[PDB]
């Protein structure tokens, strides 16, 4: 019959996703992996 009827709903879907995280993208962990000369086998020095 004549009138105005509320059928469904309208929602705006998003476009592509966006992720944002700070300036810190690394701290030089190379202090252990790549020294000039490496130590013994079982003198595992706890470089923390």
């Amino acid at each position: 019959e004549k009138g105005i009827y509320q059928t469904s709903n309208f929602r705006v879907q998003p476009t592509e996703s966006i992720v944002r995280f700070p300036n810190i993208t690394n701290c030089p962990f190379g202090e252990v992996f790549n020294a000039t000369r490496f130590a013994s086998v079982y003198a595992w020095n706890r470089k923390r």
Partner: protein
């Protein structure tokens, strides 16, 4: 970890190196520390020893190679050595109360000083 040994490494024959041994406190020095090594065949002869009040005595016949110093800020130890030779073919230890056997002491890390 009461005692930690600092520095050291492989030594080229005809080269020189310096050792270190950070100390937990001046109270554990009572009354004889140890810069002990394991020389090949040679008996266990003490090289570096010192006292909590700040004394120092060294073996007369083996003191032509070894020098000792300290700083009290970091409680770091200096063992400035010159003219390293083949009589050190082992890895060292800086352990308190070494002279009282091998059971009344805490073992840290130690460092290796060897040449060909």
């Amino acid at each position: 970890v009461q005692l930690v040994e600092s520095g050291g490494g492989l030594v080229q024959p005809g080269g020189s190196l310096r050792l270190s041994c950070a100390a937990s406190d001046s109270s554990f020095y009572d009354y004889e520390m140890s810069w002990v090594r394991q020389a090949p065949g040679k008996a266990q002869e003490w090289i570096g020893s010192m006292y909590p009040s700040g004394r120092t005595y060294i073996n007369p016949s083996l003191k032509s190679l070894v020098t000792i110093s300290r700083d009290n800020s970091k409680n770091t130890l200096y063992l400035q050595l010159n003219s390293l030779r083949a009589e050190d073919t082992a890895m060292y230890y800086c352990v308190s109360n070494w002279a009282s056997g091998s059971t009344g002491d805490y073992w840290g890390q130690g460092t290796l000083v060897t040449v060909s």
